[PDB]
Amino acid sequence: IPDGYKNEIDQLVKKEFANITLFLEEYRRKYPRIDTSRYIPNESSEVSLLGIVDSYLKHQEIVLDTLLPQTVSNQWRINNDYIRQTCTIVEEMNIQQRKQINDLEIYRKR
């Protein structure tokens, strides 16, 4: 009985039981360390010149040189093909485990 004998035996087993890094782990408490929230805002009228040039121009020039297209979609789709080779390998192992698992149960059945 998948509802009586298991419940019965469980009670009998129950009755016999009645008889018988520092920085990382601390951050886990649930707060990430704040980063530099400075570069994005700034102010023309406000304080500090370096922020204008020591924050925005050079990074924007590096951005415009970095922000690209020369290769475009070819570099992306080349990596997409690699992901498909990686995926099929896992499912082949899913099969190999599936066959040997059923094979062991098959021997028990006899």
């Binding site: 018988i20 886990r28 360390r33 704040i34 980063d35 570069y39 990074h59 990686t86 390998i89």
Partner: protein, 118 residues
């Protein structure tokens, strides 16, 4: 396709000749210096044997958050298994005593039927 240490997608994968398994070079090079042996198989292995804004602020912050809360939660998972790996073995041994107690009970009841005939 992945490293067999960190769980990375290696930039410079290197394979060991004792146990055919691909590791990222920096991570395997660290292990040999710590203790000169293959991490998986525990077989003798040497180094020669082998064959700005969001990036600074938002992205780097998330990476150290994801590492921190993951290992802490992983440490919590390891504790639960040790917490009651014990509830498994105790309930198992509890069942063993029931079987041993019933093994004396059954055959003795069955032997009383054989004696009853006389």
């Amino acid at each position: 396709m992945l490293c067999a240490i960190s769980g990375k997608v290696p930039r410079r994968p290197v394979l060991s000749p004792k146990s055919r398994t691909i590791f990222e070079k920096s991570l395997l090079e660290q292990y040999v210096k710590d203790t000169g042996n293959d991490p998986i198989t525990n077989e003798p292995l040497s180094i020669e044997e082998i064959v700005s804004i969001p990036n600074l602020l938002t992205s780097l912050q998330n990476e150290w958050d994801a590492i921190m809360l993951e290992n802490f939660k992983l440490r919590s998972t390891l504790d639960s298994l040790t917490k009651k790996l014990s509830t498994v073995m105790y309930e198992r041994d509890a069942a063993k005593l029931v079987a041993a107690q019933l093994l004396m009970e059954k055959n003795e009841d069955s032997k009383d039927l054989p004696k009853s005939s006389q």
